[PDB]
Design a protein around this ligand. Structure first.
Ligand SMILES: [Fe+3]
Ligand SMILES: [Fe+3]
Ligand SMILES: [Fe+3]
Ligand SMILES: [Fe+3]
Lengths: 238, 202, 238, 238, 202, 202, 238, 202
């Protein structure tokens, strides 16, 4: 198999840069249209991260920052598969996540919300997907967070995630939400996405058969990245 | 066929997850950073630095930047590089940094990349691929950094020449300076407005 | 009958000037709103073109540029009626058309697509409508054309057309497409038109009873221009 | 696994031999019913074709007959999978295709249609499916073709194909059409197939993510052959 | 009642159909062009020229322009002109041109028009109606060209006075020059941005 | 479970794709044909020839025919043959031909096949499987060719005996002739009407 | 205007020749398909009948055979328009009609039905259409008629008609029925027509505003013939 | 667009309306008939006669036949004839007849037609267009009658040569005979079965 370029990003499946309902996008969006280019080796390659450098608790947000006791909050496991748009598993991709604690408070200098800080919770983790594109991490469910867009704006509970995979063209950062959260319907950040089906692609689903008795709940969440086409005739990549 | 998962802003606390040290969180033994030069890395060492400005001309003090580039011979440290050439074994090709919360300055310590093959037998001028994430930015913005001392190579570069508004090509060229024997390329990014930086859909 | 002004152009029936999905419109659209004016003789008059100057093959795109043989491609006749919005026929209007060849290639210096050029095809024609507002021309069906908006953008097969009629206010340039072409649903240029019914007004329909056996297919396509109102009281035009 | 016979051909999924709307079938259809037989080694075996004999451009209809330049017309890639009725891939099957050029003209002595011949297009190709049952070829989209059934009859654009696979009982010749072609609904040859779902099984679908920018469109078309049942008790084949 | 057929951009190859000569296609014996002056045409000969600029200040090199105007006595060569006056018999009143592919300059050879009646007994200052089509322009843009040497007539013009932002009126006035005895009016069009040209919905 | 792709006629130009030489198209270096005898092929060489007639008694001059058969020892050159016997290594077992456009005659050069096992321990008489495709024929028609000099084997053949109308069995028997030392079997096919050839659903 | 050929007859809009439910068609239908030809002057021309030869009562079936009194039965006027398939009126076409009397009895040697003969009714008329394609005749409504197809078969009330118009290709004979007759749904002759919409095209509609008080009812029935296409390019007719 | 009114059989009493005399109904002063020869008609007088047979070989005794043909110079007495030649003024070109109720014989008295132009500059052999209506016939059947003494013209006739089954062409040729100085062409029509007459969709 000789690989060609990644399929074009479908801009109608993503938010636009300028989205007035999300106020800080007004000054941080280009006024010119993006210039599309034909891909070269620069866009189809990406770095490789060795598992050797990852610690044993890097994917365990419940214990990786625990000092004197366990963090307070709802114990949950999140797992799923990362695939490309043609359904192929994405192997050894770097998945990084970060989130607030159970109070909706981020361990960040710029966060002054009154929700209480948890001395035993840090809020970040990472992991590599396996050969089947599977990932799994454990954490405390985050609480919704007020913020100033309109004065009484509230983000639904969410976990931020980032993927570095096989090609630079696949680079993606997004956020996932939890099935049933009523704030999902009012969030101006989620509403920057044009279609209802795409908004639903960011909701992690309760996975009841995978809850661990007397211990933790579980949510299932799959991620889809851009995929490469195969070439059978002229190979113009180089 | 499936649709790509939709992008969402990284938000103001993107550092917790991607640069925990900048947020004062020591949970990882190995931390990813903005230093791509290892002791045995080949090539000329350069420093790439600048600021990112919003539409009012103010720097973003919460922006996160990553770069991806080839080694000194123009080979990518990636299994997807098909050149059949051996890459420098002491080079990741990637780095990540955040703008300083007070000044807005960002920087990387890296190596000047070699020229990489373009499509259909062409040759690309030396460049570093760069992406920007921040509160207010719904999808990471892609751009490239070329070097003002590679004028001849830049003039023949396929991607630069694919920008039909010739006046905008200059926003992608960093300026070479020399602070105490060290070579520094300054590349400021203007997200919106006059002299707006070119952004690509790749 | 004393004619008054043309009816106001209904801006909601046309694309807006700024339409971000069609990238080159971002820098080529005014930021100020259009200034509407009350019509004068300047807007209600237009030039007259005499049939005497038109050659015998001006409406025959199959033969008007043929040198050594016939052009390659699907032989088709396109015909229809030009009417004003109140249903009156538009007589002696100048209709000019242009298009790519069967490969999706334009005979233009700025077109470098790999689709092959056809030495026996030019791609332009013209004709005057008759007293019933009828027009008819023959051509080769054009092939769809890739272009750089997003990197893998493709125009559906289309024929560009222009009308100069009775009043300068009627001046119009547009494009028509062919029934059933699947690219119609994905074209960002066609999507600049706000309503689905107006997008459908640009699709030429297969006209099976008018195919010419063992020779050519036929498509029917009608065009509607702005119409003049009649005046029965004060005539303020002059 | 011990293989038994191929499953019975479902005659209601195919056209009947006598189909009066397709006039030449009136004298070329048996009046007696077909005699069904129980299969023997003669029906479950078939020949093997070695890849060694195939040239490098046998599946490239754009270049395999090109002499002075490229053929005129719409560049398209067609690909898909050949499976048996129980979903198993059909490996190393011989797929042969033939079609008219962009004008609807066949390079055949008996074709006198006025659509122009293309000196750089031949119209035939072949290929072997791979281990996943996948095939891919590139060609120029053919134009619809008038023919004399009723005097003004027109075939929709189509590509003829033939498969020789694992068993003689699977031998099949058919034709596929292109999504959206309006002639599909009027063709008496396609209407010889009794059911609407089976008529739809011959329509190749636009595969937009697999178009190659500034180069070629792509259509996806899968083929299903009869499948063998496995035997777990008496093996009466021999 | 029927709806007007919707407009669509002319696209980048608008020349194939409207100015085949500029695309090097000789299929017509009679070709429409930018010369409205015939040998016996009455009036003072003038040259109208300029460039069309996009929002970056760059000229459009693929733009197509048409003008429509009255003869020297202010009568339109159209059956819809109701003045009851005889029009110059050697004047079409219309012309078409394309910007040069390299420089972006466009021009017409025509005659300075006479004043035409306005509504309700008013008098319009001398003007030429102009329309612009190009890739990127979804509907032809209408504007008018007035003449700076008709200051008194311009001051009383109904349409100019209907523009309430007085500062924008000046974008519609062409500047008179004199290149070798020839009178030339320069009229640059700015589609977007500073000093943006006024466009009308007519 | 999936449904078989529906059949459609091969149409009048079936030669372009299946016998390009007959249509004068030289695009393939190796061309499939009607000669199954290689120099080292084992067995007695025979020529099989005939015409295909429509319901008016007229020959089809646009028909395409293929045959599939076993080698001289009754073994098929196919991985699906389960006899455990070695097949002749210089025998494809398959061939394709078209009727002549003028006369309607078709022929193959092959070998007389050996007897092949039938179901449940029976033995089939020597036969060649044949399929016909043409304009007007919606699904390829399958038949078999047996040999008149194998009367004893034919009388015990399972498939022939499964035809309950005994009078139709004879339409499947080819007649042996001898043109200049060469053995020729003549097999005419009558698609419709009197003495209509038996066709099988296999 | 230069006229070309008549549009192809749409065979799916007419009954087939062999229709086993109408028993006498079994031996009077060709077994071979019809051979379609391209039209010549022979097919596009037809005879002209002068109005001068028609008597004053030729279109009045109530009085044209009346001897001693008026025929018995329901007085009705039938009128309508003859148009071609593109909607143009058919001028000066010869329309001939015939039917049974009020008892369902035909004045024909071969009719032995017991329904009574009417000495004052003949049952045939003719007329030429006018310049608008209009025709009008007056008659007695016919009674339904038993016949031997199956033993208890009954034709709904009907009037037989024939048209000779502008081209021989338009030659047509058919029958029309009366709105609401319950036998329409059971007639095997009407059921030879494949589609329900075409069966409805033979039903004359009650036209109540055109009844003539204290005198006659009225039925409206329009007829559509094949139409000629116009030629704008090559004229191959001769 | 409208659909053609569907055809229905003429039925067994087609004579009441189309040949009232044969049904003994005298309601019309002028009656259409099978005599196309007027006293001043130009050309050679011929008699065309025959029978129409059903699938059992039995004559139809209730069939109605019409013919349409050109005059002696090959011009049609129709406004749609575009030859620009003057037609014989004493010739209708059309006639109608019914088979005799007892014998099934039908006939016309007419003139042998001249050759008429075919498409694309060709010439048609002399022919008469004929249509048949009857109980059992759902749509009138169209055929043509050519003449056996015009062998050379018949061989070059476009329509006859468009019949690909050459053996069926002969069913369209009438046989010339001579009964008492009168020239008679015999043309039997076989609706179904052996030697079935060719019918056209025109
Ligand atoms: Fe957050
Ligand atoms: Fe275009
Ligand atoms: Fe075909
Ligand atoms: Fe009747």
């Amino acid at each position: 198999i000789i690989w060609g370029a990644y399929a074009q990003r479908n801009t109608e499946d993503h938010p636009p840069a300028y989205a007035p309902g999300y106020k800080t996008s007004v000054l941080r969006s280009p006024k010119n249209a993006l210039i599309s280019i034909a891909e070269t080796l620069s866009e189809v390659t990406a770095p490789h991260f060795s598992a050797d450098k990852f610690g044993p608790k890097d994917n365990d947000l419940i214990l990786n920052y625990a000092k004197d006791g366990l963090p307070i909050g709802e114990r949950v496991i999140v797992h799923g598969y990362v695939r490309d748009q043609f359904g192929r598993p994405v192997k050894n991709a770097l998945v990084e996540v970060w989130q607030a604690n159970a109070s909706g408070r981020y361990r960040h200098p710029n966060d002054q919300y009154i929700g209480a800080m948890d001395p035993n919770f840090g809020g970040c983790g990472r992991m590599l997907t396996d050969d089947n594109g599977y990932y799994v991490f454990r954490t405390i469910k985050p609480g919704p967070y007020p913020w100033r867009n309109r004065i009484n704006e509230w983000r639904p509970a969410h976990i931020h995630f980032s993927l570095i995979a096989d090609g630079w063209a696949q680079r993606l950062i997004s956020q996932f939400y939890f099935e049933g959260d009523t704030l999902i319907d009012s969030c101006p950040i989620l509403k920057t996405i044009p279609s209802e089906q795409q908004r639903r692609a960011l909701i992690a689903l309760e996975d009841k058969s995978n809850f661990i008795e007397a211990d933790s709940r579980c949510y299932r969440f799959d991620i889809t990245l851009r995929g490469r086409r195969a070439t059978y005739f002229e190979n113009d990549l180089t | 066929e499936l649709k790509e998962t939709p992008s969402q802003t990284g938000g103001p606390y993107v550092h917790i997850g991607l640069l925990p040290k900048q947020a004062n969180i020591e949970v990882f033994e190995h931390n990813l950073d903005n230093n791509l030069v290892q002791d045995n890395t080949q090539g000329q060492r350069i420093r790439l630095e600048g600021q990112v400005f919003d539409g009012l001309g103010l720097p973003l003090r919460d922006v996160l930047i990553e770069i991806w580039q080839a080694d000194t011979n123009g080979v990518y440290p990636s299994q997807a590089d098909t050149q059949g050439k051996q890459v420098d074994p002491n080079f990741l090709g990637w780095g990540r940094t955040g703008a300083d919360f007070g000044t807005g300055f960002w920087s990387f310590n890296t190596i000047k990349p070699g020229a990489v093959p373009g499509r259909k037998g062409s040759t690309q001028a030396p460049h570093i691929s760069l992406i920007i994430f921040a509160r207010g930015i719904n999808i990471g913005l892609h751009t490239r950094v070329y070097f003002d001392d590679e004028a001849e190579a830049n003039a023949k570069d396929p991607v630069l020449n694919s920008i039909e508004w010739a006046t905008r090509r200059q926003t992608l060229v960093a300026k070479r300076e020399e602070r105490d024997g060290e070579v520094v390329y300054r590349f400021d990014i203007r997200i919106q407005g006059e002299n707006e930086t070119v952004f690509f859909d790749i």
